[PDB]
Amino acid sequence: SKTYNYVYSSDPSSLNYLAENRAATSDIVANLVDGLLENDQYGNIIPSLAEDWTVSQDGLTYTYKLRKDAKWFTSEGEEYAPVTAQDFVTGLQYAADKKSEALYLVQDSVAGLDDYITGKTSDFSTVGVKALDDQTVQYTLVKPELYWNSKTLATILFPVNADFLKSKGDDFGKADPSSILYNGPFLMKALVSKSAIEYKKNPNYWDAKNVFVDDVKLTYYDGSDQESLERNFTAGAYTTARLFPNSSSYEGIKEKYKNNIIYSMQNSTSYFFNFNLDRKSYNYTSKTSDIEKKSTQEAVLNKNFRQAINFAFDRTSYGAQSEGKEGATKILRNLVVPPNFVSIKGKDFGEVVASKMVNYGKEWQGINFADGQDPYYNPEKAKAKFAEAKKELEAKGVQFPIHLDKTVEVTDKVGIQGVSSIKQSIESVLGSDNVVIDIQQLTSDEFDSSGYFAQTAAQKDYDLYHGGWGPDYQDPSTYLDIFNTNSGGFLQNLGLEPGEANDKAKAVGLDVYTQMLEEANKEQDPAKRYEKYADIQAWLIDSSLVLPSVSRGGTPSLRRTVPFAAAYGLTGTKGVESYKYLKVQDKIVTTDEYAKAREKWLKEKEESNKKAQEELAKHVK
Numbered sequence: 001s002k003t004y005n006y007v008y009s010s011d012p013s014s015l016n017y018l019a020e021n022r023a024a025t026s027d028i029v030a031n032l033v034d035g036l037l038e039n040d041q042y043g044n045i046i047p048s049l050a051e052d053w054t055v056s057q058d059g060l061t062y063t064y065k066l067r068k069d070a071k072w073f074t075s076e077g078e079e080y081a082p083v084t085a086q087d088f089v090t091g092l093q094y095a096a097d098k099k100s101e102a103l104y105l106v107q108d109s110v111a112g113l114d115d116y117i118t119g120k121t122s123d124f125s126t127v128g129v130k131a132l133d134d135q136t137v138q139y140t141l142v143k144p145e146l147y148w149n150s151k152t153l154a155t156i157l158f159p160v161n162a163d164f165l166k167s168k169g170d171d172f173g174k175a176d177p178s179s180i181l182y183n184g185p186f187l188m189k190a191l192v193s194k195s196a197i198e199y200k201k202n203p204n205y206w207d208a209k210n211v212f213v214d215d216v217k218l219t220y221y222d223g224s225d226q227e228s229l230e231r232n233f234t235a236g237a238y239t240t241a242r243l244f245p246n247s248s249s250y251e252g253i254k255e256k257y258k259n260n261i262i263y264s265m266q267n268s269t270s271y272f273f274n275f276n277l278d279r280k281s282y283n284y285t286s287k288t289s290d291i292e293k294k295s296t297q298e299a300v301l302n303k304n305f306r307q308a309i310n311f312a313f314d315r316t317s318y319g320a321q322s323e324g325k326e327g328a329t330k331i332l333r334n335l336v337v338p339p340n341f342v343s344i345k346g347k348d349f350g351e352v353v354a355s356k357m358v359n360y361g362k363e364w365q366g367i368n369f370a371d372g373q374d375p376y377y378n379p380e381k382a383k384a385k386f387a388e389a390k391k392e393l394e395a396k397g398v399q400f401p402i403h404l405d406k407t408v409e410v411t412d413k414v415g416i417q418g419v420s421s422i423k424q425s426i427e428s429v430l431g432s433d434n435v436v437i438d439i440q441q442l443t444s445d446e447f448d449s450s451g452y453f454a455q456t457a458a459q460k461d462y463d464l465y466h467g468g469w470g471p472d473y474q475d476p477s478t479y480l481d482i483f484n485t486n487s488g489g490f491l492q493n494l495g496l497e498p499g500e501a502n503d504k505a506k507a508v509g510l511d512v513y514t515q516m517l518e519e520a521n522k523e524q525d526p527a528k529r530y531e532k533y534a535d536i537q538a539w540l541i542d543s544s545l546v547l548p549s550v551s552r553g554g555t556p557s558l559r560r561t562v563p564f565a566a567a568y569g570l571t572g573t574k575g576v577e578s579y580k581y582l583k584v585q586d587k588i589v590t591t592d593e594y595a596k597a598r599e600k601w602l603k604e605k606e607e608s609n610k611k612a613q614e615e616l617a618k619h620v621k
Contacts, residue, residue, distance in 0.1 A: 001214040002584050004239045004561075007221035007229065011193050013453055015180050016173025017155035018095040021102040021489055022452070023470055026155045028191075030577035031199050031216070034184040035159070036064050036088075036137075036152040039569035041581065042605040044612040045149055048574070049083060049159070049183070049206075050137075057621050059144030060111075066135045070206045072161050075177040075187055077202060080164065083183055085131035087159030093124045094165060095156050102156040104487045105472055109148070111140040144524065150474040153572025159183070185211045185580040194220050194444070199579060212565070212583045222444070223412035233558050239584055243556040244414065245324025260558055262594045263330065266371050266551040268341060268570050270333050270479065271468035273313070273422075273547040275300040275404075278495035278504045281461035284450060286438035287403050295393075296463055299402040301507045304389035306544035307363065309404075311382035312429035313422060313547055315374040321417040323555065333551035334369045334376070336469065336479045337537055341570070344530045349476065352531060356538035364542065371551065379429040386430050401436045404463040407451060410441045437464070457492040465493050466549065471571040476533035477521060478571065483545065484514040494545070508545060559589045563597035 010024040017029040038048035050064035070083040092110070095103065096117050107114050111128030115121040128140030141148065151157060164181050165172050173179050177188040185205050190198035199216035202208065221228070226244045230253055233241035243253060243261065254261065277300055279293075287293050299305045320328035339350020350369035357364040363385065367375050390400065408419045416439075423437035440462070442450070450461035469490065471478040482490035485501040492498075496505050505511060516539065520532035540546060562583035569575030 002212065003215040003217060004213045004579060004582065004584055005217045006219075006238050006240055008197050008218040009221050009223070011220075012175055012191075014173050014175050015177075015191075016098075017158055017180075018091055018160060019098045019100045019102075019173065020155075021100075024452075026573045027577050028188070028197065029155055029158075029180075030184075030573040031186045031579055032180065032182050032184045032188055033155070033158050034070070035155070035157055035574075037149055038153065038574040038578075038580075039567040039572070040608070041564060041566065041568055041601070042608040043568050043570050043575070044608055045153070050152075052619075053149075054619050054621060055148075059146075060141050062139045062141070062148060063132075064137045064139075066137065067206060068135065070183060071204065072164070072181040072183050073187065073202060073204065075180075075182060075189075077187055077204070079204070080181055081161055082134075083159060084134045085137040086134070087161055088137040088157075089124075089129050089131050090162040090165060091156075091158055091160045092127070092129045094160060096124075096127075100156055101489070102154065102472070104481060104489060105151055105154055105156050107487070109141050109143075109145060109151075111142050146526070147473045147475040150571050151472065153569065153574045154472045155573055185578065186216065189215075194222075196220065207580070211580055213579060216579045223409065223415060226414060230558065233560075239560050241558045243558065244322065245327060245556065246321065246414075246417075250324070257558055257588075259590050259592070260588050261556050262559055262589060262591060263327075263556055264553040266331065266333065266338075267553040267576075268338050269468055269470045269552040270336050270338060271466060271549045271551065272336060273549060274465050274467070274490075274494055274545060275306065276460055276463050276465065276493075276495040277301060277508060277545075278457065278502070279460065279463060280458040280495070281450065284407060284440040284442060284446065284461045285403075285405050286436075286440075287405075291399050292403055295398040295400070296402055296404065298396055298398050299389070299393055300404075300463065301504060302389050302393055303508070303543060304385050304392060305402070306547075307542075308382050308386035308389055308430060309426060309435070310376055310544045310547050311363075311378045311385060312426045312435075314377045314425035314429075315549060316377070317421045317425055318418055319550065321421050322414050327554075327556065329372050329374065330554040331550040332372055332374055334371065334373075334548045335537055336540065336546060336548060337476045337533070338551070339369050339371060341471075341479075342474075342476060342526075342530050344527050344534070349530060349534060349537075352534040353537045353541070356535045357541070360538060360542035372554070376547075377425075382429050386434060390434065401432060401434050403436045403438050405438050405440055405461075406464040406466075407440045407442050407447055407462050409444060409447045411444070416441065454492070457495045457497050460493065460495055467493055468552075474571050476530060476537070477517070480533055480536050480540070481517055483510060483540070484517050485510050486514060509543060510545070513539060513543070559594075560585055560587070561589070563589060563594050564601040 012024045034048045036050040037045050040046045049066050049070050051067040052065040054063045072080040112126045116127050130138045132138050186199035187202050189200045190196050197218040201211045201214045227249050229241040232238040315332050316328045319331050340348045342349050344352050354369050406419050408415050419439050454460050482488045485505050487498050516536050523529035565583040567575050567581045
């Protein structure tokens with residue numbers, strides 16, 4: 001038997017792929033449930049449960065033909081029932097009925113779905129998903145979406161068996177392998193909080209031939225023993241290992257593995273810092289007075305203040321805490337939309353955003369948004385912006401310094417160094433008589449419930465947050481919509497609730513931002529549409545409501561995985577998240593072997609993408 005062994009860091013709150021928008025859930029379910037389409041090794045969208053599909057000439061009707069040999073299985077591997085088109089009707093009705101946190105992916109796209117979710121109608125037969133027969137599912141959209149098929153790689157568009165769902169009721173989708181049915185490459189054999197996630201290859205999966213490992217075992221990793229990754233790799237227990245050049249052990253590791261260290265490419269997941277614009281919870285704070293809390297509440301609404309923090313935040317120093325001195329810039333990401341995410345007549349998105357910055361003030365003159373460098377850090381600009389913020393805030397009675405709470409997990413030693421670097425950088429540039437970053441070290445449970453797994457904006461217990469977005473579909477709106485005041489998926493992390501559009505959101509212009517998103521979304525020509533989203537991304541950078549930080553990837557590893565065997569996707573949950581396609585080998589890959597494979601993959605990706613674009617036209621009516 002061939003096994004992949006490594007670690008995981010995030011336990012899921014549930015397995016409810018229809019109701020969750022957290023990667024903690026979809027990273028797991030990517031291995032357990034398939035949707036209509038998936039990815040190949042090159043990022044092409046290829047058949048999954050749907051063996052064929054058509055789109056109408058007006059772009060509003062998508063029809064999918066499901067393969068007859070796809071079945072649902074229990075967690076023990078027993079066949080439950082064939083997959084049918086009705087399962088996609090069931091899945092969408094359930095996502096709507098449960099008010100899924102990912103409803104923004106479909107609520108404004110599928111005909112009638114907004115009316116049903118919001119109570120304008122009560123009958124799901126008016127919603128644009130239909131099972132025409134057992135093998136044929138048909139979606140009806142409100143407007144054309146060239147990116148619609150990419151959306152089927154998001155879990156809210158995955159199927160569910162209605163009888164199983166009914167039998168389970170509120171038990172459906174709990175963090176228990178028996179809470180869902182399986183139609184994907186693996187069965188979940190173990191899901192143990194703070195201990196293990198274990199997958200077993202499903203021998204009767206419709207595409208079992210493309211699953212090259214029989215078992216996947218992930219041991220819980222809390223960040224307290226970073227040397228354990230290479231230690232267990234070298235002992236033969238892990239298949240891969242992420243290296244930490246700051247560790248005392250790195251000198252010896254690099255001498256042993258001089259020809260084996262492999263750096264991954266930066267990918268489309270973007271991280272950024274944001275502020276809590278309407279903080280309600282103060283369990284984790286170093287502030288002791290209402291004047292301090294009100295002073296911070298006022299400061300985070302002040303644009304000059306946010307820009308001063310932006311220009312005082314040394315991203316190189318931050319990156320160096322995990323990547324070491326020489327690799328410090330390899331992870332840096334300077335927009336929310338990756339600069340190469342789309343192109344506009346051959347110009348990259350980030351270049352167009354840079355072009356738009358000329359209208360947002362001298363403080364952005366000459367900015368370059370390329371990955372892998374820090375265009376923000378600028379102490380003299382930061383100090384000048386802060387002086388302006390301080391005059392504005394003092395006129396309101398604000399007391400200085402402004403204390404900003406940032407949380408970190410007590411066991412997460414690299415994360416503690418990261419946040420310590422941001423404290424040092426900001427306080428060094430602006431002065432601790434002006435800003436203090438108060439680091440709150442929390443237990444796992446406290447870190448989870450005040451942050452990523454908080455269920456309301458009111459439970460967010462911090463002034464600064466560091467989270468990120470993985471794109472759900474191939475359009476800049478997947479990133480830029482997450483701050484809109486009507487339905488933004490990231491709004492709670494800013495302390496705001498979708499719908500409200502309250503005084504604080506208006507104070508920082510997020511209502512204007514939301515209106516801009518609405519206008520840009522109406523544009524159907526891709527070049528024009530992308531140009532409008534570039535202006536929207538420029539507005540957001542200028543607003544400094546986000547402080548772009550890092551991406552995933554760009555990091556060193558040792559590997560016994562076969563280079564570029566796995567699936568890859570720019571968006572969705574069927575790429576690197578999936579252990580389908582992945583292969584393991586005995587030999588530790590060399591840097592030179594990886595480089596040769598990378599150049600081969602880069603060349604083949606362009607050829608394959610061109611073929612894929614050709615194949616697309618055969619599907620119109």
